Amino acid sequence: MSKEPRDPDQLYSTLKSILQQVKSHQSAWPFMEPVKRTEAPGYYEVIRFPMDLKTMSERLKNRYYVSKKLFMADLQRVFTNCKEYNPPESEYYKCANILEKFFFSKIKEAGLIDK
């Protein structure tokens, strides 16, 4: 099934649907939770709050992320922040690329990238 409403309140269920569709991708595995202190190279020094697909969703549970620039910056924050402290590894920058591209395709279902 796909989500594609056209209202403010209905957007909560669509932005979250895009979350379930983005986290379900084969590249959201590095964004399905909050980084760590011993596993993360150093997100506490360059990426304080990247808002992966788990924290941004926790806020989207109500209305924290539902205003075009709010849902976009949140996801773009996951991809951007993740790539920022991630050199040309191999699947890290790729997945964020992929998933990000998958998000945009899902955004148009909500109408957030629209003008």
PDB file of N, CA, C and O in Angstrom, residues 12-66:
ATOM      1  N   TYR A  12       0.596  13.793   9.205  1.00  0.00           N
ATOM      2  CA  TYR A  12       1.270  12.998  10.272  1.00  0.00           C
ATOM      3  C   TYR A  12       1.361  11.527   9.848  1.00  0.00           C
ATOM      4  O   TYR A  12       2.399  10.901   9.950  1.00  0.00           O
ATOM      5  N   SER A  13       0.280  10.976   9.373  1.00  0.00           N
ATOM      6  CA  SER A  13       0.290   9.552   8.952  1.00  0.00           C
ATOM      7  C   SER A  13       1.113   9.369   7.676  1.00  0.00           C
ATOM      8  O   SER A  13       1.623   8.300   7.411  1.00  0.00           O
ATOM      9  N   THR A  14       1.221  10.387   6.863  1.00  0.00           N
ATOM     10  CA  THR A  14       2.021  10.237   5.609  1.00  0.00           C
ATOM     11  C   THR A  14       3.516  10.399   5.917  1.00  0.00           C
ATOM     12  O   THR A  14       4.339   9.623   5.477  1.00  0.00           O
ATOM     13  N   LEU A  15       3.865  11.413   6.659  1.00  0.00           N
ATOM     14  CA  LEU A  15       5.295  11.610   7.016  1.00  0.00           C
ATOM     15  C   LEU A  15       5.803  10.360   7.730  1.00  0.00           C
ATOM     16  O   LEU A  15       6.901   9.896   7.494  1.00  0.00           O
ATOM     17  N   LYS A  16       4.991   9.786   8.578  1.00  0.00           N
ATOM     18  CA  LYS A  16       5.402   8.534   9.266  1.00  0.00           C
ATOM     19  C   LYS A  16       5.447   7.394   8.252  1.00  0.00           C
ATOM     20  O   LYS A  16       6.345   6.577   8.260  1.00  0.00           O
ATOM     21  N   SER A  17       4.499   7.350   7.351  1.00  0.00           N
ATOM     22  CA  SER A  17       4.529   6.296   6.302  1.00  0.00           C
ATOM     23  C   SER A  17       5.853   6.393   5.547  1.00  0.00           C
ATOM     24  O   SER A  17       6.565   5.421   5.391  1.00  0.00           O
ATOM     25  N   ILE A  18       6.216   7.579   5.135  1.00  0.00           N
ATOM     26  CA  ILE A  18       7.528   7.758   4.464  1.00  0.00           C
ATOM     27  C   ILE A  18       8.635   7.260   5.395  1.00  0.00           C
ATOM     28  O   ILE A  18       9.611   6.682   4.966  1.00  0.00           O
ATOM     29  N   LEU A  19       8.468   7.463   6.678  1.00  0.00           N
ATOM     30  CA  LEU A  19       9.474   6.961   7.655  1.00  0.00           C
ATOM     31  C   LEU A  19       9.526   5.436   7.581  1.00  0.00           C
ATOM     32  O   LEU A  19      10.575   4.843   7.439  1.00  0.00           O
ATOM     33  N   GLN A  20       8.386   4.801   7.653  1.00  0.00           N
ATOM     34  CA  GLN A  20       8.349   3.315   7.560  1.00  0.00           C
ATOM     35  C   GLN A  20       8.890   2.863   6.203  1.00  0.00           C
ATOM     36  O   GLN A  20       9.515   1.828   6.084  1.00  0.00           O
ATOM     37  N   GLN A  21       8.652   3.635   5.178  1.00  0.00           N
ATOM     38  CA  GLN A  21       9.151   3.262   3.826  1.00  0.00           C
ATOM     39  C   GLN A  21      10.650   3.550   3.719  1.00  0.00           C
ATOM     40  O   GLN A  21      11.383   2.842   3.057  1.00  0.00           O
ATOM     41  N   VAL A  22      11.111   4.583   4.371  1.00  0.00           N
ATOM     42  CA  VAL A  22      12.564   4.911   4.322  1.00  0.00           C
ATOM     43  C   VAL A  22      13.347   3.939   5.208  1.00  0.00           C
ATOM     44  O   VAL A  22      14.327   3.358   4.792  1.00  0.00           O
ATOM     45  N   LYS A  23      12.909   3.748   6.421  1.00  0.00           N
ATOM     46  CA  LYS A  23      13.610   2.813   7.330  1.00  0.00           C
ATOM     47  C   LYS A  23      13.529   1.383   6.793  1.00  0.00           C
ATOM     48  O   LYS A  23      14.331   0.534   7.130  1.00  0.00           O
ATOM     49  N   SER A  24      12.559   1.108   5.964  1.00  0.00           N
ATOM     50  CA  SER A  24      12.420  -0.268   5.408  1.00  0.00           C
ATOM     51  C   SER A  24      13.412  -0.484   4.265  1.00  0.00           C
ATOM     52  O   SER A  24      13.755  -1.601   3.931  1.00  0.00           O
ATOM     53  N   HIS A  25      13.878   0.574   3.661  1.00  0.00           N
ATOM     54  CA  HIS A  25      14.848   0.424   2.542  1.00  0.00           C
ATOM     55  C   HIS A  25      16.040  -0.427   2.985  1.00  0.00           C
ATOM     56  O   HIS A  25      16.258  -0.643   4.160  1.00  0.00           O
ATOM     57  N   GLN A  26      16.807  -0.924   2.052  1.00  0.00           N
ATOM     58  CA  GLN A  26      17.980  -1.768   2.418  1.00  0.00           C
ATOM     59  C   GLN A  26      19.182  -0.905   2.826  1.00  0.00           C
ATOM     60  O   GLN A  26      20.276  -1.404   3.002  1.00  0.00           O
ATOM     61  N   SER A  27      19.000   0.381   2.970  1.00  0.00           N
ATOM     62  CA  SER A  27      20.151   1.252   3.341  1.00  0.00           C
ATOM     63  C   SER A  27      19.863   2.040   4.624  1.00  0.00           C
ATOM     64  O   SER A  27      20.710   2.756   5.117  1.00  0.00           O
ATOM     65  N   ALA A  28      18.673   1.945   5.156  1.00  0.00           N
ATOM     66  CA  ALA A  28      18.356   2.704   6.402  1.00  0.00           C
ATOM     67  C   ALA A  28      18.873   1.973   7.644  1.00  0.00           C
ATOM     68  O   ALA A  28      18.646   2.405   8.758  1.00  0.00           O
ATOM     69  N   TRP A  29      19.564   0.875   7.480  1.00  0.00           N
ATOM     70  CA  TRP A  29      20.070   0.148   8.679  1.00  0.00           C
ATOM     71  C   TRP A  29      21.030   1.010   9.532  1.00  0.00           C
ATOM     72  O   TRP A  29      21.107   0.796  10.725  1.00  0.00           O
ATOM     73  N   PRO A  30      21.734   1.965   8.940  1.00  0.00           N
ATOM     74  CA  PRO A  30      22.617   2.825   9.749  1.00  0.00           C
ATOM     75  C   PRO A  30      21.826   4.013  10.315  1.00  0.00           C
ATOM     76  O   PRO A  30      22.363   4.841  11.025  1.00  0.00           O
ATOM     77  N   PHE A  31      20.556   4.108  10.005  1.00  0.00           N
ATOM     78  CA  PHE A  31      19.745   5.252  10.518  1.00  0.00           C
ATOM     79  C   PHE A  31      18.524   4.737  11.279  1.00  0.00           C
ATOM     80  O   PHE A  31      17.576   5.464  11.507  1.00  0.00           O
ATOM     81  N   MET A  32      18.527   3.493  11.672  1.00  0.00           N
ATOM     82  CA  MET A  32      17.355   2.958  12.417  1.00  0.00           C
ATOM     83  C   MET A  32      17.569   3.102  13.924  1.00  0.00           C
ATOM     84  O   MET A  32      16.924   2.445  14.718  1.00  0.00           O
ATOM     85  N   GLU A  33      18.463   3.964  14.328  1.00  0.00           N
ATOM     86  CA  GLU A  33      18.702   4.163  15.787  1.00  0.00           C
ATOM     87  C   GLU A  33      19.732   5.276  16.017  1.00  0.00           C
ATOM     88  O   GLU A  33      20.327   5.773  15.082  1.00  0.00           O
ATOM     89  N   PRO A  34      19.920   5.616  17.268  1.00  0.00           N
ATOM     90  CA  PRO A  34      20.860   6.695  17.638  1.00  0.00           C
ATOM     91  C   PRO A  34      22.287   6.169  17.699  1.00  0.00           C
ATOM     92  O   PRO A  34      22.554   5.112  18.236  1.00  0.00           O
ATOM     93  N   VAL A  35      23.205   6.904  17.146  1.00  0.00           N
ATOM     94  CA  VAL A  35      24.624   6.471  17.165  1.00  0.00           C
ATOM     95  C   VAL A  35      25.071   6.157  18.594  1.00  0.00           C
ATOM     96  O   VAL A  35      24.345   6.379  19.544  1.00  0.00           O
ATOM     97  N   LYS A  36      26.258   5.641  18.756  1.00  0.00           N
ATOM     98  CA  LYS A  36      26.746   5.305  20.124  1.00  0.00           C
ATOM     99  C   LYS A  36      27.977   6.142  20.475  1.00  0.00           C
ATOM    100  O   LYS A  36      28.333   7.069  19.774  1.00  0.00           O
ATOM    101  N   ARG A  37      28.635   5.819  21.555  1.00  0.00           N
ATOM    102  CA  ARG A  37      29.848   6.589  21.948  1.00  0.00           C
ATOM    103  C   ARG A  37      31.112   5.799  21.601  1.00  0.00           C
ATOM    104  O   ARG A  37      32.133   6.362  21.256  1.00  0.00           O
ATOM    105  N   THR A  38      31.051   4.498  21.686  1.00  0.00           N
ATOM    106  CA  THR A  38      32.247   3.672  21.353  1.00  0.00           C
ATOM    107  C   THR A  38      32.151   3.156  19.915  1.00  0.00           C
ATOM    108  O   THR A  38      33.146   2.864  19.282  1.00  0.00           O
ATOM    109  N   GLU A  39      30.960   3.048  19.393  1.00  0.00           N
ATOM    110  CA  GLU A  39      30.801   2.565  17.992  1.00  0.00           C
ATOM    111  C   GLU A  39      30.865   3.743  17.021  1.00  0.00           C
ATOM    112  O   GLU A  39      31.485   3.668  15.980  1.00  0.00           O
ATOM    113  N   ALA A  40      30.236   4.834  17.357  1.00  0.00           N
ATOM    114  CA  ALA A  40      30.272   6.016  16.456  1.00  0.00           C
ATOM    115  C   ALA A  40      31.673   6.647  16.473  1.00  0.00           C
ATOM    116  O   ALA A  40      32.224   6.887  17.529  1.00  0.00           O
ATOM    117  N   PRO A  41      32.216   6.890  15.302  1.00  0.00           N
ATOM    118  CA  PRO A  41      33.570   7.487  15.205  1.00  0.00           C
ATOM    119  C   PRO A  41      33.680   8.734  16.087  1.00  0.00           C
ATOM    120  O   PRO A  41      34.712   9.002  16.668  1.00  0.00           O
ATOM    121  N   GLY A  42      32.627   9.498  16.194  1.00  0.00           N
ATOM    122  CA  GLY A  42      32.685  10.721  17.044  1.00  0.00           C
ATOM    123  C   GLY A  42      31.504  11.637  16.713  1.00  0.00           C
ATOM    124  O   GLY A  42      31.667  12.821  16.497  1.00  0.00           O
ATOM    125  N   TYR A  43      30.316  11.100  16.680  1.00  0.00           N
ATOM    126  CA  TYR A  43      29.127  11.945  16.374  1.00  0.00           C
ATOM    127  C   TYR A  43      28.878  12.943  17.506  1.00  0.00           C
ATOM    128  O   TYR A  43      28.212  13.942  17.329  1.00  0.00           O
ATOM    129  N   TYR A  44      29.406  12.684  18.672  1.00  0.00           N
ATOM    130  CA  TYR A  44      29.208  13.633  19.801  1.00  0.00           C
ATOM    131  C   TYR A  44      30.083  14.877  19.618  1.00  0.00           C
ATOM    132  O   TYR A  44      30.023  15.806  20.398  1.00  0.00           O
ATOM    133  N   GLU A  45      30.894  14.907  18.592  1.00  0.00           N
ATOM    134  CA  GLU A  45      31.772  16.086  18.373  1.00  0.00           C
ATOM    135  C   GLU A  45      31.394  16.800  17.073  1.00  0.00           C
ATOM    136  O   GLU A  45      31.617  17.985  16.920  1.00  0.00           O
ATOM    137  N   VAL A  46      30.824  16.092  16.136  1.00  0.00           N
ATOM    138  CA  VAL A  46      30.453  16.735  14.842  1.00  0.00           C
ATOM    139  C   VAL A  46      28.962  16.556  14.541  1.00  0.00           C
ATOM    140  O   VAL A  46      28.380  17.309  13.786  1.00  0.00           O
ATOM    141  N   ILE A  47      28.336  15.566  15.118  1.00  0.00           N
ATOM    142  CA  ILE A  47      26.885  15.347  14.854  1.00  0.00           C
ATOM    143  C   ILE A  47      26.136  15.142  16.170  1.00  0.00           C
ATOM    144  O   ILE A  47      25.798  14.034  16.540  1.00  0.00           O
ATOM    145  N   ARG A  48      25.889  16.201  16.891  1.00  0.00           N
ATOM    146  CA  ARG A  48      25.187  16.067  18.198  1.00  0.00           C
ATOM    147  C   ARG A  48      23.830  15.380  18.023  1.00  0.00           C
ATOM    148  O   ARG A  48      23.531  14.406  18.684  1.00  0.00           O
ATOM    149  N   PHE A  49      23.000  15.886  17.152  1.00  0.00           N
ATOM    150  CA  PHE A  49      21.657  15.268  16.965  1.00  0.00           C
ATOM    151  C   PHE A  49      21.327  15.112  15.476  1.00  0.00           C
ATOM    152  O   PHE A  49      20.714  15.979  14.887  1.00  0.00           O
ATOM    153  N   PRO A  50      21.726  13.996  14.914  1.00  0.00           N
ATOM    154  CA  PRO A  50      21.441  13.727  13.483  1.00  0.00           C
ATOM    155  C   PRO A  50      19.971  13.349  13.292  1.00  0.00           C
ATOM    156  O   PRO A  50      19.435  13.431  12.205  1.00  0.00           O
ATOM    157  N   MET A  51      19.322  12.926  14.344  1.00  0.00           N
ATOM    158  CA  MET A  51      17.885  12.528  14.242  1.00  0.00           C
ATOM    159  C   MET A  51      17.712  11.404  13.219  1.00  0.00           C
ATOM    160  O   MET A  51      17.160  11.600  12.155  1.00  0.00           O
ATOM    161  N   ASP A  52      18.169  10.225  13.538  1.00  0.00           N
ATOM    162  CA  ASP A  52      18.012   9.085  12.592  1.00  0.00           C
ATOM    163  C   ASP A  52      16.529   8.847  12.304  1.00  0.00           C
ATOM    164  O   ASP A  52      15.700   9.700  12.547  1.00  0.00           O
ATOM    165  N   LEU A  53      16.184   7.696  11.794  1.00  0.00           N
ATOM    166  CA  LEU A  53      14.748   7.418  11.502  1.00  0.00           C
ATOM    167  C   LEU A  53      14.008   6.984  12.773  1.00  0.00           C
ATOM    168  O   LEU A  53      12.825   6.708  12.744  1.00  0.00           O
ATOM    169  N   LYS A  54      14.689   6.905  13.887  1.00  0.00           N
ATOM    170  CA  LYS A  54      14.012   6.467  15.138  1.00  0.00           C
ATOM    171  C   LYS A  54      13.660   7.670  16.011  1.00  0.00           C
ATOM    172  O   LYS A  54      12.603   7.727  16.607  1.00  0.00           O
ATOM    173  N   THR A  55      14.533   8.635  16.098  1.00  0.00           N
ATOM    174  CA  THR A  55      14.218   9.833  16.920  1.00  0.00           C
ATOM    175  C   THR A  55      13.298  10.768  16.137  1.00  0.00           C
ATOM    176  O   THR A  55      12.314  11.262  16.654  1.00  0.00           O
ATOM    177  N   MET A  56      13.590  10.995  14.884  1.00  0.00           N
ATOM    178  CA  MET A  56      12.704  11.873  14.074  1.00  0.00           C
ATOM    179  C   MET A  56      11.292  11.277  14.041  1.00  0.00           C
ATOM    180  O   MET A  56      10.305  11.983  14.076  1.00  0.00           O
ATOM    181  N   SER A  57      11.200   9.976  14.005  1.00  0.00           N
ATOM    182  CA  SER A  57       9.865   9.320  14.021  1.00  0.00           C
ATOM    183  C   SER A  57       9.213   9.536  15.388  1.00  0.00           C
ATOM    184  O   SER A  57       8.051   9.875  15.489  1.00  0.00           O
ATOM    185  N   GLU A  58       9.969   9.375  16.441  1.00  0.00           N
ATOM    186  CA  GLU A  58       9.416   9.598  17.808  1.00  0.00           C
ATOM    187  C   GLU A  58       8.800  10.994  17.908  1.00  0.00           C
ATOM    188  O   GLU A  58       7.822  11.203  18.595  1.00  0.00           O
ATOM    189  N   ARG A  59       9.377  11.957  17.243  1.00  0.00           N
ATOM    190  CA  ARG A  59       8.803  13.330  17.278  1.00  0.00           C
ATOM    191  C   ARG A  59       7.630  13.408  16.303  1.00  0.00           C
ATOM    192  O   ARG A  59       6.597  13.976  16.592  1.00  0.00           O
ATOM    193  N   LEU A  60       7.779  12.797  15.162  1.00  0.00           N
ATOM    194  CA  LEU A  60       6.673  12.770  14.165  1.00  0.00           C
ATOM    195  C   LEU A  60       5.447  12.065  14.751  1.00  0.00           C
ATOM    196  O   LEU A  60       4.351  12.172  14.240  1.00  0.00           O
ATOM    197  N   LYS A  61       5.626  11.324  15.811  1.00  0.00           N
ATOM    198  CA  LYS A  61       4.482  10.602  16.422  1.00  0.00           C
ATOM    199  C   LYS A  61       3.333  11.567  16.689  1.00  0.00           C
ATOM    200  O   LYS A  61       2.184  11.181  16.769  1.00  0.00           O
ATOM    201  N   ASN A  62       3.632  12.828  16.791  1.00  0.00           N
ATOM    202  CA  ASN A  62       2.562  13.822  17.039  1.00  0.00           C
ATOM    203  C   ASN A  62       2.587  14.917  15.953  1.00  0.00           C
ATOM    204  O   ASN A  62       1.923  14.793  14.947  1.00  0.00           O
ATOM    205  N   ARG A  63       3.335  15.980  16.126  1.00  0.00           N
ATOM    206  CA  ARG A  63       3.362  17.057  15.096  1.00  0.00           C
ATOM    207  C   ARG A  63       4.746  17.719  15.033  1.00  0.00           C
ATOM    208  O   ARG A  63       4.912  18.757  14.423  1.00  0.00           O
ATOM    209  N   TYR A  64       5.727  17.170  15.700  1.00  0.00           N
ATOM    210  CA  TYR A  64       7.072  17.809  15.697  1.00  0.00           C
ATOM    211  C   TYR A  64       7.624  17.889  14.275  1.00  0.00           C
ATOM    212  O   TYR A  64       8.275  18.846  13.905  1.00  0.00           O
ATOM    213  N   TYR A  65       7.365  16.896  13.472  1.00  0.00           N
ATOM    214  CA  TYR A  65       7.870  16.929  12.073  1.00  0.00           C
ATOM    215  C   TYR A  65       6.704  16.867  11.092  1.00  0.00           C
ATOM    216  O   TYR A  65       6.263  15.806  10.699  1.00  0.00           O
ATOM    217  N   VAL A  66       6.197  18.003  10.702  1.00  0.00           N
ATOM    218  CA  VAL A  66       5.055  18.020   9.753  1.00  0.00           C
ATOM    219  C   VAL A  66       4.822  19.433   9.221  1.00  0.00           C
ATOM    220  O   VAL A  66       3.789  20.033   9.448  1.00  0.00           O
TER     221      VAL A  66
END
